[PDB]
Design a protein around this ligand. Sequence first.
Ligand code: CAC
Ligand code: CAC
Lengths: 80, 79
Amino acid sequence: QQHPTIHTLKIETEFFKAVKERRKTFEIRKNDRNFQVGDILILEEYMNGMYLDDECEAEVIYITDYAQREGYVVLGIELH
Amino acid sequence: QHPTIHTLKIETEFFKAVKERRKTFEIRKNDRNFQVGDILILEEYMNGMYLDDECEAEVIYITDYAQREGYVVLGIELH
Ligand SMILES: C[As](C)(=O)[O-]
Ligand SMILES: C[As](C)(=O)[O-]
């Protein structure tokens, strides 16, 4: 019944911090990965072309394309 | 002074998603000069009818990343 896809994405440090702090509870992404509610994002801290070896895991709990540019979606996320 | 209180209309599908904490953001034109700390009073409507319910949320985050001109995504925290 449930088969989430795990997506591993880079996230620039400023936004990583905002997510980890639960101030930013969504991700704005091109929908080239067929994102679905229940999917898992592994958000990997990245800065100036380097992975910084910190991450956080979040579930996609809501998706919308409302008012977005072609191909973009807003993914509502719940940090684990 | 105090944080601004904005009163906005929200359709029942989205109202329900906000109340359930599934939808934790609001996509809006920024013609209100929204600021972090501001309060949104979200009033429930459906197909032009006011549905005698509402909720309150704080704007905790704001971004125009990848948005159309004048648009923002407001991160909101249900009270
Ligand atoms: C600016 As983003 C891709 O972390 O929503
Ligand atoms: C769809 As809305 C204006 O409640 O982000």
